[PDB]
């Protein structure tokens, strides 16, 4: 249609693209988080939905991952993936096969979050943070990840309205 773009919002590539009912953004099935259900009546992307949504951090993390919490984490993970640095931290870290708290990567967090494998917000946020902690303790990589981390931590505060 004339009201939707022809590049996936996340990876800027063509192929099988699903249109958001409201905005111009389009997505590959698995590029959107959670995955696109074209079944739906209609399909709206998570940005347009979260736009229409209506305190200490300790509180937020302790929260059980109920339908709203689950959506907000999915919202945060989609923003992480939309950052150009997501490429680097998507798969197994480079360092992993070279002769450090737990190997972590975005595709691992993505599978877990889509599978409802985090009982609390804390599980998601801690895995996300571990990616950067593990990174820091290695090698010669400049500011790689600085933007991905900073962006997540800004969005995390904003989405759960953490203290100023």
């Amino acid at each position, epitope marked *: *249609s004339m009201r939707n773009l022809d590049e996936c919002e996340v990876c800027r590539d063509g192929g099988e693209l699903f249109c958001c009912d*409201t905005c111009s953004r389009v997505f590959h099935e698995d590029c959107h988080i959670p995955p696109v259900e074209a079944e739906r*009546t*209609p399909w*709206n992307c998570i940005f347009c*939905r979260m736009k*229409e949504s*209506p305190c200490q951090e300790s509180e937020v993390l302790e929260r059980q991952m109920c*339908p709203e919490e689950q959506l907000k984490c999915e919202f945060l993970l989609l923003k992480v993936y939309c950052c150009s640095e997501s490429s680097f931290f998507a798969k197994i870290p480079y360092y992993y096969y070279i002769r450090l708290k737990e190997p972590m990567w975005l595709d691992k967090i993505k599978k877990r979050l889509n599978e409802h494998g985090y009982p609390q917000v804390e599980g998601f946020v801690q895995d996300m943070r571990l990616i950067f902690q593990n990174h820091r303790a290695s090698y010669d990589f400049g500011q790689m990840g600085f933007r991905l981390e900073a962006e997540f931590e800004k969005n995390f505060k904003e989405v759960f309205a953490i203290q100023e």
Partner: single-chain antibody
Amino acid sequence: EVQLLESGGGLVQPGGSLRLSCAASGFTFYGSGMGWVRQAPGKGLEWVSSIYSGSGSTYYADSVKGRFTISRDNSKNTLYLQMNSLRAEDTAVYYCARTSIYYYYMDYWGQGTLVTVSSDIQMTQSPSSLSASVGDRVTITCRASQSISSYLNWYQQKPGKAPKLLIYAASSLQSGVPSRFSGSGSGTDFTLTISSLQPEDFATYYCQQSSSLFTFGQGTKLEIKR
């Protein structure tokens, strides 16, 4: 501040046509999904049609397919329902309702306008009818034909009033609703629970799936004991 006012309801000969309009104010009209829900006198709620972003995103009940046409003019903040080939089945109060796309629930309802004539997801609601006392713990339940994830809403309706949203996203308490109300469940089986029943809680309660179109439960009348 938010107001939905329906008009265009009235008397029609069978087979004839009628056009319902709903004037919206107090919210960004194009940012919101808009639905029509009817209710026959004494009967439960039935989703008719909802429109989202333009004519490409229109949905109808099998009942009214190829017979009713929903439309919107965002420039005039108006929702329309064209009604053709009208039966007696169609005689009902037609509510204008705003569907928030956050988790696909109807948080704002008009007064309703009355029209007088001369393989979807089913929602079973146990019990049909309940007698309880002030202070008692009440648990109404909804079951779904197939899985509807957490896209499940709970509504209260009282005599002479429009439905009111209690719960959205299966277990989220709508702003203003007292804390004694709570929802639970996901997949097929769901539960509305009132911890300590209050005089004002005597009403009819409908559940509603949002997963694919909308389908309402049969309703559950909660009445006082002797």
